[PDB]
Amino acid sequence: QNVGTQAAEEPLNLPISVCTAPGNCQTEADAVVLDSNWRWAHTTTGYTNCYTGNLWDTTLCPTPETCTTNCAIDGVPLADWSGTYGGSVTGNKFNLKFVTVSTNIGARTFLLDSTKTRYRMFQLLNREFTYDVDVSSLDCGLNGALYFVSMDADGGAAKYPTNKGGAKYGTGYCDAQCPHDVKWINGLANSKDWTPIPGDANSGKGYYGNCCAELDIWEANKQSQAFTTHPCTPNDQTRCEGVVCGDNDSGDRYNGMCDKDGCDFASYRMNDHTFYGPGSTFKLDSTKPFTVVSQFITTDGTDNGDFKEFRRFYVQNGVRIENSKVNFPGITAYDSITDEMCAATKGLFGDLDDHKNKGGMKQMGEAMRKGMALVMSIWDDHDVNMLWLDSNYPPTGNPSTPGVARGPCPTTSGVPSEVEVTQANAVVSFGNIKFGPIGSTV
């Protein structure tokens, strides 16, 4: 995309901590940038929309190349962050409102480095990543997500010279779902064969998808939470078409370059329904804030080893809370993501181990070694109504069959039109982000 001249781009300042030992950290003066999908797209030498509602203008965008020549994405000024997009920062806390009323629904954002010209790339192997979260106002159907993806640090600017904005304009998004709803891919409008998504007034799908590796630290609302590894072959940003995208709609979910299911550790799905929930007698009380700690263990305990284990623990009101465990007869009580856990649990659930097909923890680790961009988002789910996270999936499945039940939400929950009314004022908060060696962040 070209860059427009109507509004300066002003990312929100967000300090994080880089740590060397427990309680010995230094501030890193980073910032938050809005994903290019949420930006106004208009004519390069005017005010005329190139995209309105869920459609590209066919006169301006008869082809992707012409669209890209004629159109530009514009900046987010400071005033518009809260007023238009529902984003705000107080000290080291970042807040994202779900619906902001001209009416904005959801948000996806990235962490910029201290220069505000590149994404802050995190080399996560043999490191610990930690943050405080509040998901108390997110119920069934919503997801306040924090995760990493194998985006380029410059959003693709060096690879795709028609991308003028780079990381500064939140470009280059890709993930392990190979999404077609990304409006700008490889420096070009994804306007070919663009199709609105029914019941989604703001979104559509273009000819291409954009694939890359994804490490989900946090997919969650107050009812259920998960962390998940998604390797791809290769891991780096890859525009896809046809079978390579692994499109759900053509029966290709397991035929593409990315592991779409991922290998998940989701406490409720692993059959501990009392670990996490909205109340003081759950082990971890989702009505109150808490700290989420993630440790990425290698084979030799060094930065050069292969990724072998994703460990997790929590801190809430000064109380250390170890992760829940897998709880099925004849299955080891795993409390972390490893290749063995993935094989054993997917075996039990009858899920295809595409994680293993894509190179497993080792391949996931190669993405983490090269460095990944931090994503913070809030969203509802127009495909599957978040049932995969917090309900029975498939909805018609027996909840006593291992793998089906992922949370207590009813299978009628999560319809975007309903959650966008009922949960309009939901806000996820991510704060006090800390990064360092294992054992350094609490």
Domain map (residue ranges) of the chain: 2-442
**237 with 166: CB under 8 angstroms?**
no
What is the Cα 201 distance to its own chain's centre? 22
Amino acid at 324: S
CA angle 46, 49, 53 (to 5 degrees): 165
**9 with 169: CB under 8 angstroms?**
yes
Give the three-class secondary structure for 295: strand
Closest CA to 239 of 165, 172, 147: 172
Rounded Cα distance, 255 and 202, in Å: 29
Rounded Cα distance, 7 and 85, in Å: 15
Closest CA to 217 of 44, 30, 8, 375: 375
Closest CA to 168 of 68, 32, 13: 32
**157 with 151: CB under 8 angstroms?**
no
418 in catalytic set: no
For residue 80, give the H/E element and its range: helix 78-83
Give the DSSP letter string of 360-418: HHHHHHHHHHH-EEEEEEEE--TTTTTHHHHSBSSTTS-TTSTTTB--S--TT---HHH
The CATH number of 2-442, from 3.20.20.370, 1.10.10.10, 1.10.357.10, 2.70.100.10, is: 2.70.100.10
Amino acid at 311: R
Pull the structure tokens for residue 24: 């010995």
Q: Which of 128, 219, 366, 420 is catalytic?
A: 219
- Burial of 140-158, coded b for 16+ CB within 10 Å and e otherwise, reads bbbbbbbbbbbbbbbbbbe
Task: For the beta carbon of residue 317, count every other beta carbon within 10 angstroms.
Answer: 9
What is the Cα 326 distance to its own chain's centre? 24
Rounded Cα distance, 74 and 208, in Å: 23
Give the three-class secondary structure for 242: helix
Pull the structure tokens for residue 282: 């759950």
Rounded Cα distance, 27 and 30, in Å: 9
User: How many Å is the maximal CA-CA distance in the chain?
Assistant: 66
What is the Cα 428 distance to its own chain's centre? 13
Phi, psi at 14, each rounded to 5°:
-145, 105
Closest CA to 312 of 340, 284, 331, 281: 284
**Dihedral of alpha carbons 142, 220, 138, 278, sign:** positive
Q: Is the peptide bond before 234 cis (omega within 30 degrees of 0)?
A: yes
Rounded Cα distance, 168 and 33, in Å: 7
Task: For the beta carbon of residue 232, count every other beta carbon within 10 angstroms.
Answer: 29
Q: Which of 214, 309, 366, 420 is catalytic?
A: 214
For residue 320, give the H/E element and its range: strand 319-322
Q: Is the peptide bond before 394 cis (omega within 30 degrees of 0)?
A: yes
Under the phi-then-psi rule, with left for phi > 0, alpha for psi from -120 to 50, and beta for the rest, what region is 167? alpha
Rounded Cα distance, 431 and 313, in Å: 17
Phi, psi at 214, each rounded to 5°:
-145, 135
**119 with 376: CB under 8 angstroms?**
no
Supply the DSSP symbol for 133.
Answer: E
Radius of gyration of the chain (CA): 21
Closest CA to 294 of 341, 263, 343, 335: 335
420 in catalytic set: no
Residue 87 forms beta bridges with which residues? 96
For residue 421, give the H/E element and its range: helix 416-422
Q: Structure solved using which method?
A: X-ray
Give the three-class secondary structure for 10: coil
